Design a protein around this ligand. Structure first.
Ligand SMILES: Nc1ccn([C@H]2C[C@H](O)[C@@H](COP(=O)(O)OP(=O)(O)OP(=O)(O)O)O2)c(=O)n1
Ligand SMILES: [Ca+2]
Length: 1108
DNA sequence: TAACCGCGTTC
DNA sequence: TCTGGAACGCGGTTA
């Protein structure tokens, strides 16, 4: 209909644009010989590196469905080739002996849109006897295009919903109709291009030969082709204190880089003078020679950008958040200027509002930064990312100086624009491009989708490929019920008990300051009894060798035994510690694969595993619940298109009202509004189920292990280089960052296999399997702690890792020597626990198909759960709570032996936003715990820094320049949603957002993600802090505006002193600094037996009493 | 006091 | 239409 025409027309537009960019549709010659990959060089065709793919319509050259594929050929050119393929989904039946009856129904019922029918079989993991070869019979419906596939779904849903409802009433005194035989539709929601990419085993990033028969992968060709890559960034005018408006604000410059060649177009109507060619090579490996394009006016600028793009023909354009700032600005500045960007460069927004093209992938690096970098949110800006992954500081410029510096210091502003471009091209080439394009080789998505789709969706794609290739029927996307009940109470949420976290000790621990250890002598007895087989376990399992080939096994056994035996005779010791960290490698994935954990396996073929369920429900019983429902049934409610009734509403809106009224009732009759209960649960895990899910996790884990191991290889290569070989250590350090980043980008995707069984809309949902994963790790990590606390002092614990200190005389690291001369590394702290993990947690019931033809299985033991050890570290600093007895989890600082920071967890320094005074305070303070000869001398050095920070606040800031003051006292906080979505809520961010609007206009709060830079006033006295919160920007406006809003915000019309120094609630920030000093310095010092080093910060009353 | 929320962390 | 999980710290309101 009118949908077809729009789609056929779009295909014609896209076809013309592709040809302008060098993608003419290529048809390979004919061949009547056998189609075999071995004979690839003789089958006529064209070879090309696959760079993109998109669904389209074809007109015998109604529309025909197909997928365009974009190639770069070996002769420096490009072409595209199309594959047609009939879209299809399946109809399931509830009586396989009458499948033809249903077949003859839908042939006539779907005669308007059906192209062909077929009876096919697939394996159904929910079917009885499916592990014996019994398959489910289905009707495969096929169509000419996707719109016809959707037309059939619209005709098939009435049948499915009518069968779910009961039958009509005819003769009350009384072979079923074939319409009732339709059980369900299946695989109806697979995106078409994912369907073609899976069924035809085509992947972006591989080499193919487009022949008449099909696509032949050329395994001979190895390395990727080199696409023409461009990355650009723009700079716009901006009213002071406000945001750029693509309506009124013009753009001044566009800076970009094409394969290393730098460019910068300028808008002379805004920037004052012509800019000469200049260079920005921030580090030697980032060459940046920039040729300038000075143009009269904005149109002239935009056509250079469009003409240059048209001439170099980029197949990848990279930006940094250019999907929601840059591209929409260029578009609107092209609309006002009468330029159609789509006819110019083939770029346009899509359904999600992101800007895309047919021939060119848009690589928004911010998506990679946000999803795969593993960097914190505070470190996700371009400057922080450039500092972390590129190893240099890019040029800075306060955005309020950008519009003026187009006039005053243009060249200064030309160096900032090129900086953003240099950092973006090399961020893409070094990190984003290799990662995403490699991922495309195994994921049936094009580059644009591999970069932006959620990691759970990426997992589902990987799993569907396995499911299809093993002829397993795809389950339909899971749907959660609108209401669930527990014990007669309406549930508000349910979950499983997740990871185990423990705060066990606080204070400073350093390798030069002795500690007191109490060694359980029975513990040493157990280690001595397990020592012979633990060392064998290290040889044969941990290093995949044989004790027959090690030549110092007895020496090592004796040295460890001697060290252990002395520790037993002296169980009370005051020694230097060893600050060690043990962590299970890929904990949850390895827990899953060890126990054959997968959603379809939750049902000696049965392994019972326990998990913990936690529910949150209303205190109201049924008898009450029904009462509030019938109350709302008698009420009127507004329409949404002039008044409706409860039952005339939707089910969703119904329970929305029920929940609100249920909360109110319980808050009165019960006072409590939500009750939480935990119940232990068991689940059967079949050990014989088709392991397509488990095997997918095992493969992707092994994929990550590759890069994780290379990061450890090169960490050792760098430790072997002499400090004088400067060029060698830089290459080694660059390898370390590259592989550490690659293994980290694989980490989120990996652990998303564990999270996917709880994702909304998941095809393989199982709360039980996730709950079992969490409880098992909780058992292992506590088993490990139970041993550490008997031999040393565990400090902190989270999920699968333990930080601890061990006596200096505890057996540490050893090196088996093989007859080959090669050595094997052994760390006894790790091997003692790994022998226990493999004594108590191995799955002895793991099963695999031996003979698949006769369906014979074998049973073996499996366990891939290993602690890895890092250390020994120079220092660890763990903070303590302000409340008595409580600890602080997920926060500490760790230092390497050479004095550099190893880890910094949780603290405000790294968190996004937060109070700059506390941020800057933490930066200066942690490195100071390294000073001092004794523990008491250590705390004194930190107190010196403390009292300097207390001095600036006690002096009401009089010691800082007013520029350093506006930065130290400000606190930034982001707003996830728009301010209108926070109605009925008070906070400092909301107040700042409201006042920013009453002063700079509602056009500021128009967009979510607003940063609220505020300072708290002492002005409304004894008033809630959420009200005394002023936008920092007010101290930067003209004086009348400042006083009006100030006096109003202070409730003091007698206010003429508009100096920020007088408005600040110094006592508030003095108390904030106090809580920081208490938790990092003084209160941990008390738990370590050192009197308050910072007496100006008084101890809590409970601490002063315990001191006595 | 304890429940409770928003944000951004550690797993 | 998209869309991995739970545990936790902290400032701040609220019952
Ligand atoms: N983003 C994350 C981080 C962690 N986890 C869960 C699953 C992990 O198995 C477990 C432990 O977290 P780690 O940081 O130890 O991650 P891994 O054990 O997977 O990796 P590593 O080998 O680096 O320890 O926490 C998760 O689900 N999602
Ligand atoms: Ca781990």
């Amino acid at each position: 209909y009118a949908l077809s025409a729009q789609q056929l027309l779009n295909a014609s537009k896209i076809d013309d644009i592709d040809s302008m960019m060098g993608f003419e549709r290529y048809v390979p010659p004919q061949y009547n010989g056998r189609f075999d990959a071995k004979d690839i060089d003789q089958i006529p065709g064209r070879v090309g590196w696959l760079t993109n793919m998109h669904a389209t319509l074809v007109s015998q050259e109604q529309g025909i469905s197909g997928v365009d594929f974009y190639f770069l050929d070996e002769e420096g050119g490009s072409f595209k080739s199309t594959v047609v393929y009939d879209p299809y989904f399946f109809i399931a039946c509830n009586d396989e002996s009458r499948v033809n009856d249903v077949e003859e129904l839908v042939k006539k019922y779907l005669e308007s849109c059906l192209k062909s029918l077929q009876i096919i079989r697939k394996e159904d993991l929910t079917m009885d006897n499916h592990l014996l070869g019994l398959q489910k019979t289905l009707i495969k419906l096929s169509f000419v295009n996707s719109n016809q596939l959707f037309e059939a779904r619209k005709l098939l849903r009435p049948i499915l919903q009518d069968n779910a409802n009961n039958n009509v009433q005819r003769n009350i005194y009384n072979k079923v109709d074939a319409k009732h035989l339709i059980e369900d539709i299946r695989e109806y929601d697979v995106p078409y291009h994912v369907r073609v990419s899976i069924d035809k085993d085509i992947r972006v990033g591989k080499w193919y030969k487009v022949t008449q028969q099909g696509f032949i992968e050329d395994t001979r060709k190895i390395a990727f082709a080199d696409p023409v890559v461009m990355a650009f960034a723009i700079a716009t005018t901006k009213p002071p204190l406000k945001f750029p408006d693509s309506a009124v604000d013009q753009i001044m410059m566009i800076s970009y880089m094409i394969d290393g060649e730098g460019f910068l177009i300028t808008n002379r109507e805004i920037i004052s003078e012509d800019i000469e060619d200049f260079e920005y090579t921030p580090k030697p490996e980032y060459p940046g020679f920039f040729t300038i394009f000075n143009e009269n006016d904005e149109v002239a600028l935009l056509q250079r950008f469009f003409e240059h793009i048209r001439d170099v023909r980029p197949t990848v354009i990279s930006t940094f958040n250019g999907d929601f700032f840059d591209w929409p600005f260029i578009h609107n500045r092209s609309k006002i200027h009468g330029l159609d960007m789509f006819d110019e460069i083939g770029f346009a927004p899509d359904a999600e509002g992101e800007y895309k093209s047919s021939y060119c992938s848009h690589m928004d690096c911010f998506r990679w930064v946000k999803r795969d970098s593993y960097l914190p949110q505070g470190s996700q800006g371009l400057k922080a990312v450039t500092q972390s992954k590129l190893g240099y500081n890019p040029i800075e410029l306060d955005p309020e100086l950008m519009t003026p510096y187009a006039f005053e210091k243009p060249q200064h502003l030309s160096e900032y624009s090129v900086s953003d471009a240099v950092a973006t091209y090399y961020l893409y080439m070094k990190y984003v491009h290799p990662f995403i394009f490699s991922l495309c080789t195994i994921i049936p998505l094009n580059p644009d989708e591999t970069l932006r789709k959620g990691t759970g969706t990426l997992c589902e794609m990987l799993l569907m490929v396995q499911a299809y290739q093993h002829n397993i029927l795809l389950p339909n996307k899971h749907t959660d019920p609108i209401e669930r009940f527990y014990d007669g109470h309406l549930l508000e949420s349910e979950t499983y008990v997740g990871g185990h976290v423990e705060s066990l000790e606080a204070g400073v621990f350093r390798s030069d300051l002795k500690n007191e250890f109490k060694i359980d002598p029975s513990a040493i007895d157990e280690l001595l009894q397990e020592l012979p087989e633990a060392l064998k376990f290290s040889v044969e399992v941990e290093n995949k060798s044989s004790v027959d080939k090690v030549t110092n096994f007895e020496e090592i056994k004796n040295q460890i035994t001697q060290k252990l035996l002395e520790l037993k005779e002296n169980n009370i010791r005051n020694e230097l510690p060893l600050i060690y960290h043990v962590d299970v490698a890929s904990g949850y994935p390895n827990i899953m694969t060890t126990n054959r954990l997968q959603p379809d396996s939750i049902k000696t073929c049965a392994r019972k595993l326990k998990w913990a369920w936690r529910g949150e429900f209303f205190p109201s019983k049924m008898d009450e619940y029904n009462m509030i429902k019938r109350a709302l049934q008698n009420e009127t409610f507004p329409n949404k298109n002039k008044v409706l009734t409860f039952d005339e509403l939707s089910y969703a809106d119904q329970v929305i009202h029920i929940k609100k009224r249920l909360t109110e009732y319980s808050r009165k009759v019960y006072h409590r509004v939500k009750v939480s209960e935990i119940v232990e649960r068991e689940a059967i895990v079949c050990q014989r189920e088709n392991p397509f899910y488990v095997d997918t996790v095992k493969s992707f884990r092994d994929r990550r292990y590759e890069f994780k191991g290379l990061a450890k290889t090169w960490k050792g290569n760098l430790s072997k280089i002499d400090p004088s070989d400067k060029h060698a250590r830089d290459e080694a350090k660059k390898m370390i960052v590259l592989y550490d980043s690659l293994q980290l980008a694989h980490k989120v995707i990996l652990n998303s296999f564990y999270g996917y069984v709880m994702r909304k809309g998941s095809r393989w949902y199982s709360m039980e399997m996730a709950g079992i994963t969490c409880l098992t790790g909780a058992t292992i990590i506590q088993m490990a702690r139970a041993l550490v606390e008997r031999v040393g002092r565990p400090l902190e614990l989270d999920t699968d890792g333990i930080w601890c200190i061990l006596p200096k005389s505890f057996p540490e690291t050893y090196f088996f020597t093989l007859e080959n001369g090669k050595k094997l590394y052994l760390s006894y702290p790790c091997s003692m626990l790994n022998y226990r993990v493999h004594q108590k947690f191995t799955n002895h019931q793991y099963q695999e198909l031996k003979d698949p033809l006769n369906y014979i299985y074998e049973t073996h033991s499996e366990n891939t759960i290993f602690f890895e050890v890092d250390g020994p570290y120079k220092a660890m600093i763990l903070p303590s709570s302000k409340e008595e007895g409580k600890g602080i989890k997920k926060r500490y600082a760790v230092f390497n032996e050479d004095g550099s920071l190893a880890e910094l967890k949780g603290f405000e320094l790294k968190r996004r936003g937060e109070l700059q005074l506390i941020k800057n305070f933490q930066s200066d303070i942690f490195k100071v715990f390294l000073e001092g000869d004794t523990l008491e001398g250590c705390y004194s050095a930190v107190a010196s820094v403390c009292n300097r920070w207390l001095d600036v606040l006690d002096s009401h800031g009089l010691m800082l320049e007013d520029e350093d003051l506006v930065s130290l006292i400000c606190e930034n906080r982001s707003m996830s949603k728009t301010l209108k979505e926070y109605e009925g809520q008070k906070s400092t961010s909301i107040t700042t957002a409201r006042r920013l609007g009453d002063f700079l206009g509602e056009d500021m709060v128009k967009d979510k993600g607003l940063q609220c830079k505020y300072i708290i006033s002492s002005k409304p006295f004894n008033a809630p802090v959420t009200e005394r919160a002023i936008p920092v920007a007010i101290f930067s406006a003209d004086i009348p505006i400042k006083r009006s809003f100030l006096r109003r915000w202070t409730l003091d019309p007698s206010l003429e002193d508009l100096d920020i120094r007088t408005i600040i609630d110094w006592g508030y920030y003095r108390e904030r600094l106090g809580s920081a000093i208490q938790k990092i310095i003084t209160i941990p010092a008390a738990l370590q037996g050192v009197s308050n080093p910072v007496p100006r910060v008084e101890h809590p009353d409970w601490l002063k009493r315990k001191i006595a």
